[PDB]
Amino acid sequence: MKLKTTLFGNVYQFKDVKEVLAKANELRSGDVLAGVAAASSQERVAAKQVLSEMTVADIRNNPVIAYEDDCVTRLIQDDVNETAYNQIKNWSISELREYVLSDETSVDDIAFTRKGLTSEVVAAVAKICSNADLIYGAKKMPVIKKANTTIGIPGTFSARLQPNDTRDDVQSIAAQIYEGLSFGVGDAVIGVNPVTDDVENLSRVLDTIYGVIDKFNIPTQGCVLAHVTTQIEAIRRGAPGGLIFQSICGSEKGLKEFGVELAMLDEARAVGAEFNRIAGENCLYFETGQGSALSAGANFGADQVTMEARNYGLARHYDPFIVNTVVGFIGPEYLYNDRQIIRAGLEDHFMGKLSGISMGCDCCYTNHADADQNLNENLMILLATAGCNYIMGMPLGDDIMLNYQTTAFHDTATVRQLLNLRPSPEFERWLESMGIMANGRLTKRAGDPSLFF
Amino acid sequence: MKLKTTLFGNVYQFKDVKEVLAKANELRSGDVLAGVAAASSQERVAAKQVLSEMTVADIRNNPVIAYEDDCVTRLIQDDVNETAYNQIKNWSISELREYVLSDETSVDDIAFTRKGLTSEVVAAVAKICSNADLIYGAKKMPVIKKANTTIGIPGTFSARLQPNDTRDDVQSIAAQIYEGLSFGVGDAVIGVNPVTDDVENLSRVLDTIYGVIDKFNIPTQGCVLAHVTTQIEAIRRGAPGGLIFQSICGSEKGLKEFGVELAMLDEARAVGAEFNRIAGENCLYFETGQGSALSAGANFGADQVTMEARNYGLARHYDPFIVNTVVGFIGPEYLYNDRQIIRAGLEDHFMGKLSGISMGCDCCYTNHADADQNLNENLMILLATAGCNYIMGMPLGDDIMLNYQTTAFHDTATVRQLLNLRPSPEFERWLESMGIMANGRLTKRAGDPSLFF
Amino acid sequence: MKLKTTLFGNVYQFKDVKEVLAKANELRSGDVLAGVAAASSQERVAAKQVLSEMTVADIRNNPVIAYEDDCVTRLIQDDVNETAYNQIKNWSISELREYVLSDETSVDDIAFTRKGLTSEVVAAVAKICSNADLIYGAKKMPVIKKANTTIGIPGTFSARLQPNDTRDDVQSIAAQIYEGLSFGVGDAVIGVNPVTDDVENLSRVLDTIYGVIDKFNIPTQGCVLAHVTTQIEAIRRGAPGGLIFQSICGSEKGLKEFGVELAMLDEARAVGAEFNRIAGENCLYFETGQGSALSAGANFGADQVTMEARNYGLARHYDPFIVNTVVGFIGPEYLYNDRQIIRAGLEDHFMGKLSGISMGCDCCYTNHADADQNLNENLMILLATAGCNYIMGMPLGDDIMLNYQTTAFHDTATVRQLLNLRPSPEFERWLESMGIMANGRLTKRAGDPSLFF
Amino acid sequence: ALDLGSAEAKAWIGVENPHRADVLTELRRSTVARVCTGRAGPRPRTQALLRFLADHSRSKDTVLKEVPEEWVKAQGLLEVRSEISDKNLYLTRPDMGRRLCAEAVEALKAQCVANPDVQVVISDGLSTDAITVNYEEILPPLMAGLKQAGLKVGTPFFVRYGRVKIEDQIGEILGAKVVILLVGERPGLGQSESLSCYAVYSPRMATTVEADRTCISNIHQGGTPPVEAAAVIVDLAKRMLEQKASGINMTR
Ligand code: B12
Ligand SMILES: CC[C@H]1O[C@@H](n2cnc3c(N)ncnc32)[C@H](O)[C@@H]1O
C-alpha cells in the first residue's frame, strides 16, 4: 500500500494507516485535541486521496488497536464474514464509496457486502464522503428492527420519549410522558436517565413508565438508562423489562472506564430473553458519540470518527433494537460549533447504517459550545432525509437534568408532516385510536397532555 | 389438575399428563404401534376434555422427558420467557385454543404469547383442534425469515428444488435444476440429498448447484442434506455454503441416534456466519416428521405428535431459515392412509407456526403406504391455504433415489396461480427478468428447461 | 375407435365405451356395487389411457342410455351446439383435458367450447384428471348467475342457510335463521327441507322465511325443498315464491322414481316467471349426488360419475340459479370413506362447472360412513380454492332432521377469511349495514343471533 | 398405440414449443427423473400423468410380492424368519421385525460358525425385486473377496421379514465382529431393485445407536452396480476390523 501522494507538486507522506484515517477527517476540535488532525486543507485532501486509494484489505488488516490487546477489535474481526470480505478485499476505498452510492447497488447487495467490512473500513468510506454523500448513502441503507414497535421502515420516523428529572420525581416524569405522547413521541422508547443509580429507584421509574403503558395499552417499551448491571438486577427482581441500555465505547480500555464487561452485554441479552416484555426479537439499546474514547484516554492515537465506527461494530454483534449517537452531548473540546456537530451527526448516522444497526441520533448541543437550537433543527431534518431511525423528544428540548438541549416533541411532529413520514405502524395505530393523529398529522386536539385525563 | 372426566356417565381415568396427550390424538397407526392410543372413540374424546381443562402450568411442569435427563427438554425450558409464561400459566388449554383462533388476537399478541409456551403445550393445543382450526390458526401465525430470499410473507409461497440422483450424477442433478427453475421452484432452497457422505462429493454437488446460481445470478441458496459434520468440514475447506442442514429429533436419545449433539448445531451457526453466502440472518435448515422418535426408541412412551412438537421447540432455539416436516416419508406403520397423513400435515404445520419457526411441509407418501398422488395434491393445497411457507419440488414428484413421491414442480405453479400467491419477492424478480413469470403466472415459455441454453 | 391398449406387456381389452368410462373412475364403493369397477390399478390406468385416446365424437355418439329410450339423453343431445361440436369432435379426451387446463384457454374460449360437449364427454374429462386438475380446471371456469344476489363471481363465496326441524317448527327454523345470518350465511338461499309434504305446511315455512327477509330487507331468496309439484301449488295459491327446487336424476327412469316429468320443470320455470320475487333471471334450484341413479336401478350399467354428469347436462337446459351436489348424503355403499367423498366432491364440482351451471356442493357425510367432521373441513376448503359457488350452513353442521352432518355457519366465515373471499355483493352490503361484517371479516358483535332483536 | 411401460414412453418429450429441442433430448437422457414432460397450464400433461399412474400400479405390487422358498434353496441358505408371520403384519410392526422368532435362535447357534470376523446376512426387507435381481451379481464376489486374503467368514443365511436393527441380535448370537446386512429398500415409483448394505462393528442391542452403522445404499443397475458394490463392501469390512469402529466412529 502507498502512504504518500503528490499534490500541487508537493509530496505528502504519512506514517501509517492510523495517521491517514485521522488526517482525512474534516476539521474538528477533537482531532486537534488528539494531535492527529491535518495541518492544512492540502494535507487533509492528500490524506483523503491516499485513503481512497488504499484497499479494504489495507484497512481491515490495520486496526487502530491490535487484535490480541483489545476485545472490541477481536469481536469486530471475529464477526466478519470472510466470504464477503474476500469478494471486496481488493476494492479500494474509492470503489467502495462509489459502490455504496450506486443506484445499481440494491439494499440486498449491501446486506451481504457490509458483512465483509470492519469498523475501520466503515470509517474509511465516511471520510471520503461529502455531506450529501453521507445523507444519500445512508438513505439507501435502511435497517429495520422490531420490539413492540417496528422501527426503520422507509417512510417512517420514530422518536424516544426522554422524561428526565432532577430528582427522578415520578410526577415530573409522568408529566413529560403525557406531553410527549400527545405529540406522537415514544414509538422508539420511553427512556429515562436516572439521577440515582440504585435498584429501588429504577423499579419506581419503570413502574411509572409502564403504569402509563398499561393504562392506555400503548405499543412501546420502557427503559431506564442506568448502568446495565443495575438494570439487570432490577429486572431479575421483578421490574418490568423492556429495553436494556448501556453506553458503549470503541475500545476495551474505554469499556473498562464505563465499568462494562462483554459478559454483561451477553447477560443483558439473556435477561431480556427471559424477562422482558418484548414481542419482537430486539430488546437492547446503545448510545454512542464522538469523543468518548478520547475522553477516557482510550483512543490510542486514533481519531474520534474511526473510534466511533468501532462502537457500531461492537453494537452490531448484539443486534440491538436501537442505537443513537449523542452527537453534541459532551462539549466543544470534541465538536466546537454548528458545522462540526452537523458533519459528525451525518458521519455517525452513515457509519451506523453501513454497519447494519438501527441507527438513530440525539441531535443535541451544550451551552458551553458555539451552538443554538437552530442547529438542532438543521441537523434533525438533514438526518430525517437520510432516513434516521429516530431522534429524542423533550418539552422544547430542554433537559432539566442532563443540562443540554435536544430536539422537542414539536420537532418530531414537524419532521413527520414536513416529509410525509409516519410513526411506527403499531404506534401510529394507537395514536389514531387516541384521536391524536390522523393521516400522519396531529389532530386539532393533539399536543394537549390533558387529553389523557 | 384432574386426570379424570365423566362422559355419558362413564368415568375415564388417566395415569398422567403423558397418557392424556397421547390418547387425545386423532387415530393414527403410529400411536397404535406405540401402545399409547385411546381404546375407543369415547376415551379419545374424554382425553380431549381432560386435556382441554388442564392449564398451561400443568403441561409446562410435566414434560414427556425429565429436565435433568434430556438436553432438548432443558433447551425448551431454558428458552421460555417467564414473564410471558406467568401471564398464561393459569389458562386452560381450552382457553389457549380460543385465544389462538380469535380474530381479536393479532400477530403481535401471539409473538409474545408463544414465548411463554413449551412444545408439550404446543402439541396440547393442536390435539383439541379440528382440521379447519389447524388451518385457520396456522394462517394467522405467519413466520417470516430471510436468507437470500424472504420466505413466509403472507401472500407468498416458496418451494424447495430437490434434485436428487441415484449416483449423485451432476448431469442429472443439473438437469433437474433447470427443470425446477423453469416452473418457479427454488426460492426456498436448491437442496440435494446426497448418496455418499464425504467431503469431496458434497463439494462436487455444491459446485454444481452454485455454478447454476452464479451463471444466472439466481437469488437463492444451495444445500446438501448430508450430516452436519461433513457439511461444516466441506465449507471450512472452501465449498460454497448456503444453508446448513441437519435432521433433528425431539429427544437427547433421538439426537444421539442421529449422531448429533447440540454443540454441532452451535458450530453450524458459527460456521454459517463466517463463511456462508447469505444476505439475511437465517441460514439453518431442519427436517422433521412424526415417527422418528419412536423409530429410534427415543419417545419414552410419548405419542408422535408431542415428540414432533419438541422438534420445533428445539429448532426455535437456532432460528433457522426453513423447517419442514416430511409428513409421510417413513411408512404406514406411523401414518397409514390419506386421512392420517393430511391430519399430521396440518398438525405439524400448525405446531411449527405456533412454535415461531419458518414451517414448511414435504407433502409426500410412500409406496407401501395406503396413499397415492391425489393425496399429495389434497394436502399441498390445504397447507397452502394454511400459509405453509414452502413445499418440495421434483419432476412429477418422483424421487429416483429416496424411493418416495413428493410434490411436482407443476404443483407449486398450480398452487401459486390457483391462490394468487407469489414466490419470494427476490426470486420473483429473477423469474420475471428471465421471462419465466409475469404477474405471478407462468409465461408461455415457462416449464421449458431448454430456456437456460 | 380403439377399445384396447397394452400396459406392461399385458393387453387390456374393453367391451364398449360404457365399460371404458366406468373402469377409468377412481376406486369407489359405488362402482364396485354396480359391478363396473376396474379389477385392479393396472386395468384402471389402462382404461384411462383408452379413454384419453378416444375422441369427443366417440363418446358423444355413445351415450350410456340410447336417444330414443331416454328423455334426458335427448335433452342433452338436442341442446348441443353442432358448430361448437364439429370444431372439437375429432379432439381426443387427452387433448380436451389439456385444453381446459391451459392458461392460454380463456373463460370466453370455454364458453363456446362447452356448448359442443355432452355429459358423457364432461364425465370423460374428469376421469383423466387428478385432484389438483379438477380443482384448478374448475377455478378457471366460473359460472355466474343472478337472483336477488349474484353468485359465482371470482373472489366471492356464498352459502345456503339450511334451517331444518324434526317437525317443521317455525320457532326452531327461525332460530337457525338468525344464527346463520349472524355468520353471514344465506346469500345463496334460505332453504328448508320440509318434514311434511303438504301445501299448508309449505306456506307456513315460506311465511316464516320471508317474514325475516321482509323485516330486515335482506337481499336473498327463500325456498322449501319439497316436491316441485307441491311448491308450484303453494306459490300459485299465494305463497312467497323465491327459488323453486327439485331433485334430479341422470336418467328418465331415475326421474320417474322421483315422480318428476320434464313438463314439471318447464312449469316451474313458467311459475317463477309469473309469481316469484326474484330480480334476476335465475330462479331454479337443483340438487344432485353420485349414487342416486344406481339407487333407483336406473344407471343402466353406467358408473355413478358418468350418470352424475348427465344431471348437469339436464340442469343446464333450465339455467338454474344454483346447483349443488350432496356429495355424501346417502351412505357408504356409494362413497365409503374420506378419500372417496373428497374425490367425488372435486369431480362433481369440476363437471358442473364444465357443464356451465352454478355448481355448489353440500360437503357432507353420514354416520354409517367411515367419515368425520374433519372430512367436511378438508373438502370445503379444497372446493373453495376450486371456486365452488356455495356450500351449506347449519349450527355446527348438525342436521337434527336429515340425520347427517354438513358444514357449519363457522365454516363459511372461516373459508371467507382464510381465502379473502367476500359474500355476494348485495348480501355483503346488507351484512355491512347490520354491523355483522366489515371488510369481509366478522365484526366483534357477529355470530350472535340476539343481534336481530 | 403406446405401452406406458416402454422405453419410448420413458423417453417422451412433452414440451410444446421448446427453446432448444436438442437440449431437451440431452437433459431427458441425462437422468431417470421425469423431466421435459411439458405442461398443460400449470398441470402435468396427460401422457406424463398416465405413465405416473401406470408406474405406481406396478410399484404397489412390488411391495407385497415375496421371494419364493424355491428360490432360496437354489442358493443354499438357511430359511430363518423373525417374529413376523406374513407380509401384512410386517408393514405395521417394525418392532417385531427387529427381533428373531423362537425357532430362529435355535437354528443360528446350530447351523453357523462361532465368532466370525465378517457375517453376511441377507433379508428381503421391503422389496423382493431388490434381492432376486442383484443376488447372483453381488454375493459370489462378496463371499470370495472376504476369503481371498481375508479372514474368518461366517455362514450366510436369509432372514425373512427382517429390518435393519435385527443385525444387532445376530451380532451377539453369532458373536461376529462385523455384520453385513443386504436388505431391500422400500420400492420407488419407477423401480424396486434398489438394495442397501447396513454394516456395524460389534453390535450390542443395549448400546448400539443407528449412527454407529455404515450404509451403502442404491445398489442396483441404475445406481451402484452389484459387482462394483461387492468390492466396496469388502474394503469397508477391512476398515472396520482395523479402526475397531463403524459409522460416525470411523475416520477418512
Ligand atoms: C426412511 C429413511 C430414514 C428414516 C428412517 C425411519 C424408518 N425407516 O423407519 C429417518 C427419518 C430416521 C432417516 C433419517 C436419516 N437418514 Co435416512 N433414509 C431412509 C430411506 C429413505 C429408507 C431406508 C429403507 O428403506 N430401509 C429398508 C428398511 C427395510 O429398513 P428399516 O430397518 O425399516 O430402516 C432402518 C434404516 O433405514 C435406518 N436408517 C434410515 N436412514 C439412515 C441413514 C443412515 C446413515 C443409517 C446408518 C441408517 C439409516 O433407520 C431405519 C430404522 O432402523 C433411505 C433411502 C434409501 N434409498 O434407502 C435413507 C438413507 C438410508 N438415509 C440417509 C440419511 C442421509 C439419513 C440421515 C443421516 C440424515 C441426517 N443427516 O441426519 C439420518 C440418519 C438417521 C439414523 N442414523 O438412523 C442416507 C444414508 C446416506 C449414507 N451415506 O449413509 C440414505 C441412504 C438416503 C440418502 N440421503 O442417501 N432416514
Ligand atoms: C449520562 C450520559 C448519557 O448520555 C449518553 N452519551 C452521551 N454521549 C455519549 C458518547 N460519546 N458515547 C456513549 N454514550 C454517550 C450515555 O449513554 C449516557 O446515557
Ligand SMILES: CC[C@H]1O[C@@H](n2cnc3c(N)ncnc32)[C@H](O)[C@@H]1O
Ligand atoms: C434420508 C431421510 C431424509 O429425509 C428427512 N426425514 C424424513 N423423515 C424424517 C423425520 N421423521 N424426522 C426427521 N427427518 C426426516 C431427513 O432429514 C433426511 O434428510
Ligand SMILES: CC[C@H]1O[C@@H](n2cnc3c(N)ncnc32)[C@H](O)[C@@H]1O
Ligand atoms: C331428502 C333428500 C334431499 O337431499 C337431496 N339429495 C341428496 N342426495 C342426492 C342425490 N344423489 N341426487 C339428488 N338429490 C340429492 C335431495 O334433493 C333432497 O332435497
Ligand SMILES: [N+]
Ligand atoms: N465514540
Ligand SMILES: [N+]
Ligand atoms: N418427530
Ligand SMILES: [N+]
Ligand atoms: N347422480
